[PDB]
Amino acid sequence: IFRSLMDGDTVLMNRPPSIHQHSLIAMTVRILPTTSVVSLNPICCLPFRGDFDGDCLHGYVPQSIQAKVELDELVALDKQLINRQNGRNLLSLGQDSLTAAYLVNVEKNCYLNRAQMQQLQMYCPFQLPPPAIIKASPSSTEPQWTGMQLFGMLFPPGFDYTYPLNNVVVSNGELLSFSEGSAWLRDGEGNFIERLLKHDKGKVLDIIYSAQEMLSQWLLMRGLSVSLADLYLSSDLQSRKNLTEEISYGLREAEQVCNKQQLMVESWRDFLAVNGEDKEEDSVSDLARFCYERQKSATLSELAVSAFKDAYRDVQALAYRYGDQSNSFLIMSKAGSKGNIGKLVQHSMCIGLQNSAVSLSFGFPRELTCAAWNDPNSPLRGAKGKTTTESYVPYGVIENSFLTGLNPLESFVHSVTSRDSSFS
Amino acid sequence: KLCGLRFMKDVLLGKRSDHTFRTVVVGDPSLKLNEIGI
Amino acid sequence: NLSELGEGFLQSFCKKAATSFFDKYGLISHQLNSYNYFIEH
Amino acid sequence: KKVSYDRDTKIINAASFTVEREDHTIGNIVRMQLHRDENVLFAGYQLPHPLKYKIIVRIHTTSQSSPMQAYNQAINDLDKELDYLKNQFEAEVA
């Protein structure tokens, strides 16, 4: 009495390690013509915390009828719609429907005609809204639809949503207003997915599936790519030169701010007081001694790191000025799909601060040039000119970025800093 | 190696069962969220 | 002279010197030398 | 049955044609030909599953002609266009 596996049966899927109860999800078996591989919806990768790069999923097949009955009533996907860790939604659009929704809600200038709208309606559960755009030119027929009405076909007619932070107003299933922010689409306290789940909780999965299909079709119609113009982060050569000079001056100002902040100790209380001191020039004449004094202490190093980050936030804030609206990296950073602003800064303008949090027997020469490596008195050569030293906390700033290339000393510094990163 | 606490883990705590499969997983947006492609 | 050799000539000489070094010693020479020294002496 | 006729009860004058063993090369041209007719309101096709070779075509018409009539008229017009193009190519080659 043993029949072969077919459609409708439930299996208990799991991905090692099982770090939380949502790794056990009961799914219905669907037969596919493929072989030696299993497939699932990419949105469902979040509960498993797994990618698609060689990750293997091992499943369990119940045999007794009672185990099958209790499997889809407690361990099924529709029963795990609420995350038990924080009370929010468990399933969310992973970076793809997210990117497509951000693009379709931010542009507001790429109208869709009747044919494309009807083609995209096949993947939406609800009907078609009015075009709302009858004429856009004095000699333009064929009234078109707007981008924000395309996303409004995913909401039920009786669904009301309001997100004041992003100025999002949803009334009668229609998206009325949206300014910016890309926060109501990601996972959060007031995301639209959570409100939909709290509204009906009966067809949320179908809505998510239809939205994923429609947004994938729309993105295929548009197309997203990354080219060298995204990494260049400039319109022409003059803009690139201006950006390079601005980055250099910002790094110099950040270093000066760090050196100024390093003087907030008890040894300089006589200098910090409002009096007459003749040693004002000596505090700025010794520029190379500040690095050695910083790398030999821990509290000073932490204060320097904090000051450098505070002064480098403004430096990172230049990509929005020197970047275009159609920048793929900027779009993916604003939408919260993949990456952040700092990664773009390291890609285009400058890597920034590179420091290790372990005690080593060598330091950084603060210059990262050919002359700095050949200096006998540099901190990299064991001791910074002797009174001797025994340990150092490395602290260096790389002016170059990953696009313009890295010097061998800069690559050595980056490797030393990044050696501390390891899962195992 | 099978001694002490490792013996307990390999015998009583951790066990191997039948009717199981293990394969590599790929992406397929055509399937539903609650469906697995076998 | 001082700078009459040129820049490209030095690059070509560096490439030729690297080629000669790879032709003489090769990628595996240290192990061979260590084993030969253990037999002869 | 290669092509199946299914009627929609919620929407008047609506039909869903499921064509088996088809691809985009036929659905796209059928959809583009259906838009030329004035009586066709909604015309589109989709391929929900690449592994299952099926094409679903949805046709909405007014209260003047049936969706099947519009589908047949579009097919006949496309065949006539193909014949005209073949004749033009034959005349051009010689």
Add this chain to the structure above:
Amino acid sequence: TSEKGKENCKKGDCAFDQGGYFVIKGAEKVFIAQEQMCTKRLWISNSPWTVSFRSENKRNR
């Protein structure tokens, strides 16, 4: 195989390895460079503070 002539190029090795291995039981064995401390340099350690003189051949530390 060392200093082989032109007749050995058509029969024998595949001309893809320099031959830095050993054949023990049909398997290739490779030695890895073992990094050891220098025995010809004065070594100074801390906790406790001491200076040691390494032994060259016999234990005369």
Add this chain to the structure above:
Amino acid sequence: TYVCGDCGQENTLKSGDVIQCRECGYRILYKKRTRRVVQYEA
């Protein structure tokens, strides 16, 4: 039928103890491929 190594000669020996090539001295033999029709899908 078995082909020898550096020596060109067919041993054609099926005995359990016969593993050494005749008049050659080496004990390495390669099985010869006969004329058999095999089909492949291109």
Add this chain to the structure above:
Amino acid sequence: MYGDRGKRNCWTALLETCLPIMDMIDWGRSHPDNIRQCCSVYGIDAGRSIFVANLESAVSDTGKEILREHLLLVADSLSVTGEFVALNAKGWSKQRQ
């Protein structure tokens, strides 16, 4: 303060040093930063409250959002017998004893 390995607690010694300056230090809020000796100085409830606050701070620093009920349940489960036992086998054995 240096770790007093004797029977005298560091809090009691700190109270003796601050005799000349008592009104300036608010003793209605001053508490040891440690969790175990706080339960002996002020009581098990104060130690539990400080433990909950530290757990919330650690969760916030970890970058994750955890509901209050889980942390409260952990705090109440780790202080059933009026003493914060360790997570090793000795603490579990003592709690069961």
Add this chain to the structure above:
Amino acid sequence: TYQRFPKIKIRELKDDYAKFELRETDVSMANALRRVMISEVPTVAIDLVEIEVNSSVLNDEFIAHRLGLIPLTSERAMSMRFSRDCDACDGDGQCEFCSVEFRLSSKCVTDQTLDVTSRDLYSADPTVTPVDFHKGIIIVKLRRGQELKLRAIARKGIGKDHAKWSPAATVTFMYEPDIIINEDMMDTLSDEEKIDLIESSPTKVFGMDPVTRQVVVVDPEAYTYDEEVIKKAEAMGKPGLIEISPKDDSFIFTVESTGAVKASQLVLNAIDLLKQKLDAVRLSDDTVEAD
């Protein structure tokens, strides 16, 4: 409401190369024609082999795979039937409607290296002789000895599977853009900026006229739809200087064949196959509607 009336004009026509212009039609029709001619036009190719002597340095499977990709003349591809539907046949060996037998035999008895090309591949039917372009397609190289004897058959197949029955070679089509020049904002630009604007175009689309000292349009069908001149004009301060828009009812085709069938015959076969598919769909729809 009714059918369209496309226009076809042929610019260049050769045995394996054809470039014709299609006008008064939609993009979908051209895309479907391209897909049919690149994936649905059937040809003849070697799919099953039978090796009995093989002592070369290459594996038998590699030789079979490289033999199955040799182009063959497919003038009878439309009339031939598929092996799956050949009722009055077995499936293996020389057939009358589905399979054609091929024989190959090579033996090297000289000191020099013998190259087994595709010219010494004989078949029973003279109408299926492989296309000869030259020395032929190299199959294997033989040293002194190393005989190779092979027997293979060829069947009719669609180009959808194995990508070896497809006769098309990157069949393309464009929209034939029309270049619009204001001819009034160019007078503001000096002679130095005109050279910079000309050099901005990756291809030779805009030329400098010496007698009139202005820019003209030469070979308009080489713009490649790359936003280079428009971006340069916007950077220089002229936003609406050059406006380029793709034409929807005009197309320029470029059909390249692998030598199996002629390009004009390839287009005719693609049209016939599309018509047959439409007729089958119409018959299915009529059967569903009538009953």
Add this chain to the structure above:
Amino acid sequence: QQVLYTGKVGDARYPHPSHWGRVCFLSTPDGENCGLVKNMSLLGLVSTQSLESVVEKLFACG
């Protein structure tokens, strides 16, 4: 590099300035033995024992 209890390597895991031109400071085996195994550079040579005596030559220099 032979280190007892490779689980806690300590300092001998990170690249050193003495690794300039001798061993690769950018390619190390990720895992438990990270930093212990070091790949030699292309221009890497290992000195052997000298057979001749340099005492007389050194005394001849002054």
Add this chain to the structure above:
Amino acid sequence: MIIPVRCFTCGKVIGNKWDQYLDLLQLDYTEGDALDALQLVRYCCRRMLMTHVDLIEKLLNY
């Protein structure tokens, strides 16, 4: 390793253009001029004709 036939991405038969390419390279011609003389306008076929390595010679020798 003989030349990859049929230009995997392009679809053009390029199996008979290796001897001609070698003959052109033997004369005073560069890779670009030799590829242009063989009428290869797409860079896919040029890459296929340029990235191929002749390995069958060593197979026949050794």
Add this chain to the structure above:
Amino acid sequence: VRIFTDAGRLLRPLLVVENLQKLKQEKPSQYPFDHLLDHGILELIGIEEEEDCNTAWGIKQLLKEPKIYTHCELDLSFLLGVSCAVVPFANHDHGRRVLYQSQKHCQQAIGFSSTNPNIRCDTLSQQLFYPQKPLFKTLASECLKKEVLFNGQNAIVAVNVHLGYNQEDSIVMNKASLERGMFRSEQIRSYKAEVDVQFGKTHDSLEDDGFPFIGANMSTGDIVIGRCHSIKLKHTERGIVQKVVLSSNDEGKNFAAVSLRQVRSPCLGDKFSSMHGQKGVLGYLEEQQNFPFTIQGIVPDIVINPHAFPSRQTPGQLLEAALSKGIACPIQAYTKLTRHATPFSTPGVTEITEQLHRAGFSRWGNERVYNGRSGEMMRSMIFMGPTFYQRLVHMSEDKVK
């Protein structure tokens, strides 16, 4: 003064400029390394001696400020290993990905196995049908003059989304390109048995000597070596018999080796890797008629998800693609063309853009594409370039349990 002459010291050659002017004499010649060492043009410097002398990095800095650069380096890319110096734009990529590429992906690549497989009976010998050398050139590779440093094939790779089938660092390849012979490799597995019982059939594919004939398709439950017991193939053992080797030692113990070969076509779950730490598994096989073809009809063989770049932080693969496209595309003067991709001597981005512009394409590497399903023209250009990829030894059918 500290002098060392013992063994175990690591040395490297460096250029000395004190007698570098002596080089310019009898210009056309191939310099032996021994001649240069004897004449003092080059010397070996230890780790302790290097910290005392001043050494310049490049040769351009030497000509700027001489007399302070008594020592000089030949090439900065030689500081890395043999598996790391061959990687283009090594300093442009992140350290973690360059480490992965130099450690794991180089070892797991499938390339040249050997030219004499008849004398080797090693287990799991994998070989690719059509190995291809990379379009870009590296100084280390040029000096070594070995094509075995690169194991893989290069394909036209486009950075775009394809119906969401390439999500979660997945890869979508072209069905038509794989069926023509791309990324097709063979696997030869050898089975060994020792006899001191004798070889025999003792009562389908076995011959009278106890071994199957060459050319027999072996499956599960079949005997590969017969002894009289016999050794049978397991559940995941299959292939075609290639050769049978019999050998014995001086002790009289006979040995038998049988090799089985099978062509490993790219399956749906196969894992592939790049030269910049980009690793992912195949997600979907798409027909050639459904790809976003360009104006000239070149369809992308591999489509990768754009979301991997902003997170993995691997810039240089795009630079490699642009350089390869510029090299491959025709010019409508091929001499003096930028082809080298030395890690520490990479050409500037402006040079790459100019080279690609002179070839007739866009300066940023992106080209206008047309949808293969509907025929409409996409709004945004897609970046395409022939990057060099690798195939890893991990297969989908080797993980089924």
Add this chain to the structure above:
RNA sequence: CGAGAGGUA
């Protein structure tokens, strides 16, 4: 049956 080294998630 164990033991030793590498690798995958």
